[PDB]
Amino acid sequence: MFEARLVQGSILKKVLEALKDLINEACWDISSSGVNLQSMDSSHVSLVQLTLRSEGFDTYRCDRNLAMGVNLTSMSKILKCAGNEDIITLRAEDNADTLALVFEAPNQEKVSDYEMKLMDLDVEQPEQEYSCVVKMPSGEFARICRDLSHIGDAVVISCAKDGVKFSASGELGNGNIKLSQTEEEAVTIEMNEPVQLTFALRYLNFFTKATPLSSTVTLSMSADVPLVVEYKIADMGHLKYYLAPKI
Amino acid sequence: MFEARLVQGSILKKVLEALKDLINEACWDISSSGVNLQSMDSSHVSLVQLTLRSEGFDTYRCDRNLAMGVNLTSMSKILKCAGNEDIITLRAEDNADTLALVFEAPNQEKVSDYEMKLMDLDVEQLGIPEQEYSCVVKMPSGEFARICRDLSHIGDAVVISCAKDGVKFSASGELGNGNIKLSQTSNVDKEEEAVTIEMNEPVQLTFALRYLNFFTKATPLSSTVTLSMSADVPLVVEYKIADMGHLKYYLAPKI
Amino acid sequence: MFEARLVQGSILKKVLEALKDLINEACWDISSSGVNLQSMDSSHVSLVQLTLRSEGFDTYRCDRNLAMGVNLTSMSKILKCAGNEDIITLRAEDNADTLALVFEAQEKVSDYEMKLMDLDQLGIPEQEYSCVVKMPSGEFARICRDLSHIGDAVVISCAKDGVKFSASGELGNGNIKLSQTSEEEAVTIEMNEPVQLTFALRYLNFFTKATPLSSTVTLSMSADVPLVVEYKIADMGHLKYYLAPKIE
Amino acid sequence: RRQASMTEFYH
Amino acid sequence: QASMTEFY
Amino acid sequence: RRQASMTEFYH
């Protein structure tokens, strides 16, 4: 059996709001260390990697390792039936067709319990050091991507020790945003060697749906390899987006 | 002649927001005791019954009985032109193809006056007898709205099961199934957050979530709502219009 | 070489939000005295006149006079990328195909470059009006917005005891009466003779997009000439709308 | 599960 | 509707 | 500028 009890159900809600639009079905790897998810989008352009530590759950139990095939859209609809202050408990048997969700509403005066059908999915499957790493406010990054979406299709991210630059171009003109280095409102840069890559704003605007998960976001960049957009899930783990560059 | 003056005009506004989407044309019965409305939706599945007592109006006057045929969408449009703290005065002659509405603003520097055309509408009334229901649930109105809209994500119909310890709503659909369980409450902060159950014998019925989601547009009228249930008979969802009257919805069960 | 620096960049944002839906391309007149705009909508029913004097800018510079053919929708998209507290700088060279905008934040500096078009000055006099109404802008917006649900046109009747807006349609008719009061919640009237005209509510609801620019709006009413709906851009200038009356 | 009308109860 | 072009 | 896939890198 697998039984995880999380008092901050809002985390779960936000996570699925952050994943449902980029990937529709994903395989949940359940292990003694926690719940991991790793899936590529349908177009094979970005990769999503979610890590939820077992120690971040208020109670955790996992007899054998599990691979739950979850349709993320359905689980998103069901989690819409959970209040932000609800205590959410996931529970699934080993030879289970279904995953059970329990919403224990704050006021021990309401208890919802839903049952979701699973699918036969089967699993898919390294950490690096990057030339340039930018730590900046998450809402700021979301704003930048959304605004440059009005200007062009792709954003050119240039990373140096004196700031980070996003640039876009389109038929009505072009734009350049420069963020200079300056605790949760700060922009700090760790630079190994300068970088410059180009990415599709569509996918970044998919990634920024995870903004309610963290006040800060980090971008890891290296020449000719995918970009890493990382949102720390406080006390629980992290949510990572990998975007292949344009070449 | 008929002239009614209501200081809390927002009430009227809310009443129309609760009806315009469910019934398009309705006949308002004006009499010495107040304003009454009773209409079925176009599909003949739900019945709506509005009661506004004459003693709830600040000033009230009704010489002869009236049957004003109102197009509720138009009257809703006119009431959207009134502030929430406006004093609203309805006035209509004995024949009159029109109903006059007067919006007085708190300032007293602004006075709107609208004139609405009426319809020739048959007073065609159902006969709803007063009854005793096996199970009656008093609960917060916003909670009931949240439940119905949530279960709409799961299925078409909600199974309301009513027992002495609480009420349970259940839904089923192609993506799964869900159960919400509300228990009786051993006191909250205030009265309106409580869930109380009056049961003579247990009940369990099935209703269309679409019509309930229509009913919950009356939520700004009352902080609490009650569901009255008896085997094989329609459900009654009642919202109290404090000091004035009530708005009632009747929903026929499924098969 | 033209360079204007405005610390209250929000003004620019609001201005373009009031214009992009009514006129798509307009010609900006740049001179030593400031920036002026005058354009008719595509249907040739209303006239827009914008005045931003050089003294409202914290820095102003204008070597040669300019006639910038600007697509207002594109410039609106670019200005949506600026924060409300941003310092906005417009700058254009003499033989420039483009207009440069600089958004300074809080160490963030954005810089955009917009392409201009080759665009080809109606006679606006200076008159005195029989009836002039000063009223809250949000009230006027609310009135036009409400009466739009009743009819196509609003009849503005202007007498010494107040202004009355009236509409009629197939579901009925309505009358809103504003009486003078005894500062920006006030309704004041300067009257030489009573007026009463009819205007299309569609265009007035276009005009009320300038509401975030000023707490008050003024309606100057003709005799049988266009109505003037004026929003003062405090300390900088004004935005004026001219609407021809309805003689059916 | 079909839908019963209101015209069957109250009339 | 009268035009603006008829005034100036 | 085309778009490279994720399947070329981590594959």
HEC sequence for chain A: CEEEEECCHHHHHHHHHHHCCCCCEEEEEEECCEEEEEEECCCCCEEEEEEEEHHHCCEEEECCCEEEEEEHHHHHHHHCCCCCCCEEEEEECCCCCEEEEEEEECCCCEEEEEEEECECCCCCCCCCCCCEEEEEEHHHHHHHHHHHHCCCCEEEEEEECCEEEEEEEECCEEEEEEECCCCCCCCEEEECCCEEEEEEHHHHHHHHHHHHHCCEEEEEECCCCCEEEEEEECCCEEEEEEECCEC
Tell me whether residue C57 is exposed, middle or buried, using C-beta atoms within 10 angstroms of its C-beta: 0 to 12, 13 to 18, 19 or more. buried
Report which of C73, C74, C82, C59 is spatially closest to residue C11, judged by C-alpha positions: C82
The Cα C67–Cα C74 span in angstroms is: 17
The Cα A70–Cα A118 span in angstroms is: 6
Are C53 and C34 in contact, with CB atoms under 8 Å apart?
yes
Q: CA angle, A170 as apex, A168 and A174 as ends, to 5°? A: 50
Q: Which residues of C touch E6 (CB under 8 A)?
A: 244
The Cα A197–Cα A222 span in angstroms is: 8
C-alpha distance from C73 to closest chain A C-alpha (Å): 10
3-state secondary structure of C72: helix
CB atoms within 10 A of CB A145: 22
Are C205 and C144 in contact, with CB atoms under 8 Å apart?
yes
- Is F5 in Cβ contact with A226 (below 8 Å)? no
Taking CA–CA distances from D7, the nearest residue in chain B reads: B44
Q: List chain B domain ranges.
A: 1-255
Whose tokens are 């459900």? That residue is: B235
Q: Does domain B1-255 have CATH number 3.30.420.40?
A: no
Q: Which residues of F touch A245 (CB under 8 A)?
A: 4
C-alpha distance from A151 to closest chain C C-alpha (Å): 8
Length of chain F: 11
- Is C78 in Cβ contact with A175 (below 8 Å)? yes
Taking CA–CA distances from B82, the nearest residue in chain C reads: C146
Q: Quote the tokens at residue A133.
A: 């790493």
Q: Quote the tokens at residue C125.
A: 């006099």
- Is A174 in Cβ contact with C108 (below 8 Å)? no
Interface membership of B254 toward D (CB under 8 Å): yes
Q: Which residues of B touch A98 (CB under 8 A)?
A: 176
CB atoms within 10 A of CB A125: 5
Whose tokens are 């740049």? That residue is: C30
Q: How many CA atoms lie less than 13 Å away from B9 in the CB half-sphere?
A: 22
The Cα C176–Cα B230 span in angstroms is: 50
What's the CATH fold of domain A1-247?
Proliferating Cell Nuclear Antigen (3.70.10)
The Cα C48–Cα C66 span in angstroms is: 19
The Cα A212–Cα C222 span in angstroms is: 54
Interface membership of A152 toward F (CB under 8 Å): no
Q: Which residues of C touch B98 (CB under 8 A)?
A: 172
Report which of C167, C180, C16 is spatially closest to residue C101, judged by C-alpha positions: C16
Q: Does domain C1-248 have CATH number 3.70.10.10?
A: yes
How far apart, in Å, are the Cα atoms of B135 and each of B165, B196, B226? 11, 11, 10
DSSP structure class, residue C10: H
C-alpha distance from A179 to closest chain C C-alpha (Å): 5
The Cα B218–Cα B194 span in angstroms is: 19
Q: Report D:1-11 residues touching B (Cβ under 8 A).
A: 1-11
Taking CA–CA distances from B77, the nearest residue in chain C reads: C149
Whose tokens are 């006639």? That residue is: C67
Q: Quote the tokens at residue B228.
A: 């009255």
Backbone torsions φ then ψ of B111, nearest 5 degrees: -140, 110
CB atoms within 10 A of CB A84: 11
Considering only CB atoms, A175 lies closest to which of C81, C107, C115, namely: C81
Counted across chains A and B, CB pairs separated by less than 8 A come out at 52
Are B15 and B61 in contact, with CB atoms under 8 Å apart?
no
Q: CA angle, B199 as apex, A112 and B202 as ends, to 5°? A: 65
Q: Looking at chain F, which subunits does it touch, using at least 3 CB pairs closer than 8 Å as the criterion? A: A
DSSP structure class, residue C71: E
Residues of B with CB under 8 A from a CB of C: 71, 74, 77-78, 80-81, 98, 107, 109-117
Q: What is the dihedral of CA B76, B81, B86, B91, to 10 degrees?
A: -60
- Is B208 in Cβ contact with D5 (below 8 Å)? no
Backbone torsions φ then ψ of C27, nearest 5 degrees: -105, 120
CB atoms within 10 A of CB B63: 12
How far apart, in Å, are the Cα atoms of A193 and each of A158, A165, A217, A243? 11, 15, 21, 20
- Is C150 in Cβ contact with B114 (below 8 Å)? yes
- Is D11 in Cβ contact with B252 (below 8 Å)? no
Backbone torsions φ then ψ of B13, nearest 5 degrees: -50, -55
The Cα B91–Cα B188 span in angstroms is: 43
Integer-rounded Cα Rg, in Å, for chain E is 5
Are B179 and A81 in contact, with CB atoms under 8 Å apart?
no
- Is A112 in Cβ contact with B180 (below 8 Å)? yes
Q: How many CA atoms lie less than 13 Å away from A212 in the CB half-sphere?
A: 12
Q: Which residues of D touch B125 (CB under 8 A)?
A: none
Q: Which residues of C touch B112 (CB under 8 A)?
A: 174-177
As beta bridge partners, residue A242 has A47, A228
Q: Which residues of B touch A76 (CB under 8 A)?
A: none
The Cα B144–Cα B138 span in angstroms is: 10
Q: How far, rounded to the nearest angstrom, does the alpha carbon of residue A183 sit from its chain's CA centroid?
A: 22
